Paper text:
Bacillus sp. AHU2216 α-glucosidase (BspAG13_31A), belonging to the glycoside hydrolase family 13 subfamily 31, specifically cleaves α-(1→4)-glucosidic linkages and shows high disaccharide specificity. BspAG13_31A has three domains common to GH13 enzymes: domain A, a catalytic domain that adopts a (β/α)8-barrel fold; domain B, a long loop connecting the third β-strand and third α-helix of domain A (β→α loop 3); domain C, a domain formed by two antiparallel β-sheets that follows domain A. The maltose moiety of G3 and maltotetraose (G4), covering subsites +1 and +2 of this enzyme, adopts a less stable conformation than the global minimum energy conformation, presumably because of steric hindrance by Asn258 at subsite +2. We solved the crystal structures of inactive double mutants, E256Q/N258G and E256Q/N258P, in which the general acid/base catalyst Glu256 was substituted with Gln together with the mutation at Asn258, in complex with G3.
Crystals of E256Q/N258G and E256Q/N258P were prepared by co-crystallization in the presence of 5 mM G3 and G4, respectively, and the structures of E256Q/N258G and E256Q/N258P were solved at 1.7 Å and 1.5 Å resolutions, respectively. In the analysis of the co-crystal of E256Q/N258P and G4, the electron density of only three d-glucosyl residues covering subsites from –1 to +2 was observed. Structural analysis of E256Q/N258G and E256Q/N258P in complex with G3 revealed that the conformation of the maltose moiety bound at subsites +1 and +2 of the double-mutant enzymes was different from that of E256Q. Torsion angles of d-glucosyl residues in subsites +1 and +2 of E256Q/N258G and E256Q/N258P were close to the torsion angles of d-glucosyl residues in the stable α-glucan: Φ (5-O, 1-C, 4′-O, 4′C) = 102° and Ψ (1-C, 4′O, 4′-C, 5′-C) = –120°, which is considered the global minimum energy structure. A molecular mechanics study of maltose suggested that torsion angles of d-glucosyl residues at subsite +1 and +2 in the E256Q-G3 complex are less stable than the global minimum, and the conformation of G3 observed in E256Q/N258G and E256Q/N258P is predicted to be more thermodynamically stable than that in E256Q. This conformational difference of G3 presumably arises from the elimination of steric hindrance by Asn258. The orientation of the side chain of Phe282 in E256Q/N258G, E256Q/N258P, and E256Q differed, presumably because of the closely located amino acid residue at position 258 (Gly, Pro, and Asn in E256Q/N258G, E256Q/N258P, and E256Q, respectively). In the E256Q/N258P-G3 complex, interactions between Phe282 and the d-glucosyl residue in subsite +2 are absent, whereas these interactions were observed in E256Q/N258G and E256Q. Moreover, any additional interactions through the N258P mutation were not observed at subsite +2. Therefore, the stabilized conformation of G3 likely enhanced trisaccharide specificity rather than increasing the enzyme–substrate interaction.
Residue numbers in the entry: 2 to 286, 295 to 516, 521 to 556
Write the structure that this text describes.
């Protein structure tokens, strides 16, 4: 059945890096308000804003110390209320980031929990006595080091999947769950339009927290088999839905690593799924194009079978830039557009991450002091102590680190690319002199205007929202081609995902080119497409 959230195009803002309105180098809510014309003109329907709640910022808002107050760096609740009012008067919607696997260690519940074994908040978090004079088990944090941190006062360890300042909440405690549901409903009562639900596949821990294998005798071992998508999680997520989301006309997208296309039914089926869609991570870990076709096609066909719906994306605040990960910096403009048509025109709701629509790319800062990510700074400290060299650590940070997606948004060629009049919290990528909103708005051939046109064709042609996906030319190691079919219309999406010229055989009573990123050759025959590197074309056929 048709739904507003299926038809939408979403845009993800990382507010610390979107727009600084007051010169302190930190993006803020009045900065977002000042750029709403940009998003409305792009054609965005839904804005997902990353966390904006009170936080010490050990993990840039994902360590929350008050769920009901706004981060001071970003503004006040009055600024939030102005943002939501202006978004809604522009006919757009706003979803917030719901972070309920863990809190800050400065949240009042944790300050109480850590104070005594008998404090009434003790069991709001995950506490355990050590084993053999060390931690309760051998589990590694996702941000490196142990997943357990010792409290000298009470002589027990608390669990943190993420940073030492992000103690995990104990979802086995009914009192925790009840306080969380009241908080979620307090936000929904304000008239927000839903949530992106952070780290939500991590809320169930294997009981007893058993050690995992360690044949290499590492200090700690990766611990996803102890806490990622574990049996028992669905009971908690079904109750979360019944007590909160199901009471409101909203959209939910869960961040759900560890879910595969054949295990997705309980997450996203129309009949009984806990969210409307999830971010799945199987495609985010020459490029093996056939492997990518396999993953994305498994999710297109798999969710069509269960009446689920895909969240389509190639970028977010936790990944490197998609030109580097999936395209080519030697063909930056052409590959940015080719990737855009490829991912955006599958069946699902597309998400655009800030700067993806400009073709922004990874940065390379010379010094570890120029980086911020708690995960990579802890990785550096831990690996340096083990004897890894500075150079080998920097290669990991430069090639894989999510700070590549957190540099200031590139609005123009003024100081700091127009993101701030002060000293940005993270330096601007030097390539803003070439890559910026102002230059792209005036260039018909820009990446930005290619995204504007994708959004327009998807809105104008129902086949691009609701049409059935089918993979074409599966064994072609260069060409990713697929169709969308609805009634008497078929759209053909052709993407030459290679840095070479290629030829491709086109797979009706009328044919139209809907978008293309190279000039068309009038002598070219439809039958024998001669594609340039990273050339994409979308055709609409009337059957
Ligand atoms: O609030 C903490 C943290 O949560 C969100 O992202 C984290 C994911 O929840 C978490 O699973 C982990 O992702 C890893 C995948 O599990 C793994 O399969 C593969 O993709 O590598 C990832 C290593 O991180 O980590 C991410 C954080 O990187 C949230 O969106 C983050 O901003 C936040 O820091
Ligand atoms: Ca600011
Ligand atoms: Ca040609």
């Amino acid at each position: 059945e048709k739904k507003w959230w299926k038809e939408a195009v979403a845009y993800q803002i990382y507010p610390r890096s979107f727009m600084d309105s007051n010169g302190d180098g930190i993006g803020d809510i009045q900065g977002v308000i000042s750029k709403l014309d940009y998003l409305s003109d792009l054609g965005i329907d839904v804005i997902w804003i990353c966390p904006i709640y009170q936080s010490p910022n050990d993990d840039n808002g994902y360590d929350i110390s008050d769920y009901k107050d706004i981060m001071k760096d970003f503004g006040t609740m009055e600024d939030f209320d102005e943002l939501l009012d202006e978004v809604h008067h522009r006919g757009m919607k706003l979803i917030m980031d719901l972070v309920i696997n863990h809190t800050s260690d400065e949240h009042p519940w944790f300050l109480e929990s850590r104070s005594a074994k008998e404090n009434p908040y003790r069991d709001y978090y995950i506490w355990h006595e050590g084993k053999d004079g060390k931690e309760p088990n051998n589990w590694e944090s996702i941000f490196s080091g142990s997943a357990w941190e010792f409290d000298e006062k009470t002589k027990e360890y608390y669990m943190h999947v993420f940073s030492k300042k992000q103690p995990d909440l104990n979802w086995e405690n009914e009192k925790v769950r009840h306080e969380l549901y009241e908080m979620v409903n307090w936000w929904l009562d304000k008239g927000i339009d839903g949530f992106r639900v952070d780290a939500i596949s991590h809320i169930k821990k294997v009981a007893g927290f058993p050690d995992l294998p360690n044949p290499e005798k590492l200090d700690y071992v990766p611990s996803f088999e102890g806490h990622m998508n574990r049996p028992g999680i669905q009971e908690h997520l079904k109750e979360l839905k019944e007590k909160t989301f199901a009471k409101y006309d909203i959209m939910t997208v869960g961040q759900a690593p560890g879910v595969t296309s054949d295990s997705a039914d309980e997450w996203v089926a129309e009949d009984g799924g806990n969210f409307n869609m999830i971010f799945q991570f199987e495609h985010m870990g020459p490029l093996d194009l056939i492997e990518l076709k396999t993953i994305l096609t498994n999710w297109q066909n798999g969710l069509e079978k269960i009446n689920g719906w895909n969240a389509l994306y190639l970028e977010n605040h936790d990944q490197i830039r998609s030109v580097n990960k999936f395209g080519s910096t030697a063909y930056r403009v052409e590959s940015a557009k080719c990737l855009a048509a490829l991912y955006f025109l599958m069946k699902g709701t597309p998400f655009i991450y800030q700067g993806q629509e400009l073709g922004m790319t990874n940065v390379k800062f010379d010094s570890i002091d120029d980086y911020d990510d708690v995960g990579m700074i802890n990785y550096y400290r831990i690996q340096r102590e083990k004897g890894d060299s500075h150079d080998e650590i920097m290669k990991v940070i430069w090639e894989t680190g999510r700070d590549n997606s957190r540099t200031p948004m590139q609005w123009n060629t003024e100081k700091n690319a127009g993101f701030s009049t002060g000293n940005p919290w993270m330096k601007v990528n030097p390539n803003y002199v070439d890559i910026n909103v102002e230059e792209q708005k005036s260039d018909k051939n820009s990446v930005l205007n290619f995204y504007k046109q994708l959004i327009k064709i998807r809105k104008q042609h129902d086949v691009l929202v609701y049409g059935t996906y089918k993979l074409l030319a599966e064994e072609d190691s260069a060409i990713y081609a697929y169709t969308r079919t609805l009634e008497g219309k078929t759209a053909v999406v052709i993407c030459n995902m290679s840095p070479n010229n290629q030829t491709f055989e086109f797979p009706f009573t009328n044919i139209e080119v809907l978008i293309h990123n190279y000039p068309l050759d009038k002598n070219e025959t439809l039958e024998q497409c001669t594609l340039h590197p990273y050339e994409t074309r979308v055709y609409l056929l009337s059957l």
